[model samples]
Structures are given as C-alpha cells and as structure tokens.
Target: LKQVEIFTDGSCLGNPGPGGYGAILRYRGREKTFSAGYTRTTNNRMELMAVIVALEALKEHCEVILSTDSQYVRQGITQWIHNWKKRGWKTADKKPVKNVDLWQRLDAALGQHQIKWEWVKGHAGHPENERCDELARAAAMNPTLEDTGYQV
Candidate 1:
C-alpha cells in the first residue's frame, strides 16, 4: 500500500462562527495542501472535515499516518466511535452524539485505509501543523461556503 503522512488543523472565529480546515498530505517527497471555509460551523466539524477530505483525496487504499491537534478527532475515531456505533449513535449518557453526520462520514472514510492517529500540540512550532493553522485561519476569516448541515 502507498504510505502517506497527513497533517491537518481547524480554526473558528467564534467557536460556532465562521470555520475552516486545512490539510497537507505528503508522500515520497511530494506534498499538497487543501483548505476550505464554511460560513457557520464548529471547530470540531472543521477538524473532522480536514481528515475526511485528506483521506478521500487518496485514489487507492493507503497506509496513513494522520496528525491533528484535535483530541476530539483523534479519540473519537480511535475509541469513541466504537461505542457510539454500538449504542446506535448515542453517548454513554444517552444523549445524541454531536456531529454525528461528520462522524459517520469519517467512519466511512476509514474503510479504505490503515491509519495511525497522532496527536500534536497546537501552536507548538511543528512546521506542517503551523502551516495548516495558517491556512485554516485565513480561510475562517474569508469563508465562502454555507455550512448547510450546521444547526443553530
């Protein structure tokens, strides 16, 4: 399988305000960046979007090492999703899971790859992490698309 390293980050102007996500995929000395903004969304949604888009971009199954600063994304995929699925998308307390839409999309995206999730501290000077932060922040400030799935 092809091996890839993907770094991603998310930004929001007001937590539930304009949001954006950025992703960078590197393989065999080549790298590409992707980013997009939503007019209204949450940071976690953007975080999930970053990973989703990066994985979807691959044309074939891969061995993926994905890095993100969001513990929400890291843990949700690696752990919480299992129980969430078993419980019919409800949390341990029986509350409906937040961001279920993105979570499901993320789960489906996982099907084609073998992934290792890595958590990096935000704002800690990792080059690609900082670069994605820049991209996310810039897009958040200049959002151009509607986040149709977002609920107020």
Candidate 2:
C-alpha cells in the first residue's frame, strides 16, 4: 500500500477560547491543505480535529504516517485509545472522557485506515508542520469565518 504523509497543527487565542486547526496531506505527489476555526474550543480539541479531518478526507484506505506536535493527539492514539475503549470511553480514573463526541468521531475515522502516530516537536524546522501551525494561527485570528461546528 502506498504510504501517505500528513502533518497537522492547532492554535487558540486562549485555552477554551477561539481556536483553529490545520492539516496537510501529501501522497502520490499530490498535496492538500485544510484549515478551519471554532468560535469556542480548547487547543487539544483543535489538534485532534485536525487529524480527524485529514483522515476523513482520504478516498481510500492506505498506510498513513500522521505527524503532529500535540502530545494529546499522539498519546491519545498510542496510550489512551485502548484504555478508553476498554473502559467504555472512560479515562484511566474511570471518569467519562472529556470531548467524548470528538473522540468518537476521531476513533471512527481512524478505523478506516492504517495509520502511524508520530510526535514531532513544535516550532522545529519541519516544513509541513510549520506550515500547518501557520495556517492554524491565521484561521484563529480571523473571526469573520463561520465556525465549522468543531467547537461544542
């Protein structure tokens, strides 16, 4: 299977404030970019939403390497997904998962493809990652754009 590379990032004016997510997907020499904002949301939600939106854009299943700077996303896939599912989407402390709605959407989208989770350091020299960061921040600064319902 062909392997695709995707990079995603998110930004917020303040935690639980105006936010946006950005994603870049590249495969078979083709590239696509996405950016959207929310009226009220958290940074973590935007980060995960970026990945989920990117994955949903794929037309078919393929090997994917999803790179992000958010530990929330990386760890959610690598460490928390299993526990969350095993506990009926509860946290390690047996509490209901925060943002369960988004989590469910992301979880469902993830199942449709083969993906590798990669954690990249933010503000590093990675070109795609940096571009996504820029897109996310720019969208966040634009309040005129309609909120895409990513914020709940």
Candidate 3:
C-alpha cells in the first residue's frame, strides 16, 4: 500500500490552558492542512488530538506515516498502547487513562488504517513539523479563531 505522510503538533499557553493542534497531510502531491482550538484543555490532549483529527479526516484507507513531536502521542501508539489495552486501558498503577475518551477515539481511528507512528524532535527545523508547530502555537495564542475543521 502507498503511504501518506502526516505531520502534527499541538500547543498550550499553560499545561491545561487554551490549546490547539495542527496537522499536515500529504499524499500523491496533494496536501491539506488542518488545525483546531479548544477553550480549555491540556497539552497532552491537544497533542493526541492532532493525530486523531488528521486520521479522522481521511476519506479512505491508506498506509500512514504519522509523525509528531509529542512523546505522549508517539509512545501511546508505539510503546504504551499494548499494555494499556492489556491492562484494560488502565495506567501502570491501575488508574483510568488520563485522556481515555480521546485515546479511545484515536484508537478507533487507528484501526481503520495501517499506521507507523514516528517521533520527531520539536522546533528542530524539519519543514513540515515546524510548520505544524507554528500553526498549533498560533491557534493556541489566538483562541478567538474558529475551529479549523476539528473540534471537541
């Protein structure tokens, strides 16, 4: 299967303050950018939301290379998701998942496509990643802007 490249990022003024997420999807020379903001949320939530919203926007099944600067998102898919599922979606100490609702949504979206989640260093000058970061931070800073296609 041919793979589409997706880049995503998220930002918040404070850990649980106004937040936003950005995503760029590229396939077969066509590109689309997506972004959205929330009145009140956490950085981790916004981060995960970036990927969730991106995948949700897809019209058909395709192999995906989902890239993000968030260790939370990357680790959730690559390292933690299995254990979380095995333990009935609980944390190591048996606590409920921090963002269970969003995680569950993302989990369902992921099941629709073959994805390779990758971690990239934030603000490291990778073009698409940097652009996504800019979009996310800008949206977070300007909370008055309407949602850019994805919402809570």
Predicted structure with the largest TM-score when compared to the true one: 1
lDDT of 3: 0.83
Error of 1 at 54 (Å): 0.9
TM per candidate: 0.93, 0.88, 0.87
Candidate 1, residues 122-146: lDDT per residue as tens digits? Answer: 5677889899988998999999988
Cα lDDT tens digits for candidate 3, 42-149: 788888888988999988899998888898887788788877888998887888877887888898999999988777885666789899888888888767643333
Order the numbered candidates by lDDT, best leading. Answer: 1, 2, 3
Instruction: For residue 78, give model 3's deviation from the true position in Å.
Output: 1.9
Q: In lDDT terms, how accurate is model 2? A: 0.84
Off by over 4 Å in 3: 92-94, 144-152
Task: Give the root-mean-square deviation of each candidate in angstroms.
Answer: 1.5, 2.4, 3.6
> How does residue 115 of candidate 1 score in lDDT?
91
Ten residues in a row with the worst lDDT in model 1?
A: 117-126
For residues 1-152, write the lDDT of model 2, one tens digit per residue. Answer: 76899999987889877888889999988999999877777888888888888998888888999989998887888888887898999876887788777788899989888888778985667889999988988888874454444434
Candidate 1 TM-score to native: 0.93
Error of 2 at 87 (Å): 1.1
| 1 or 2, greater by lDDT | 1
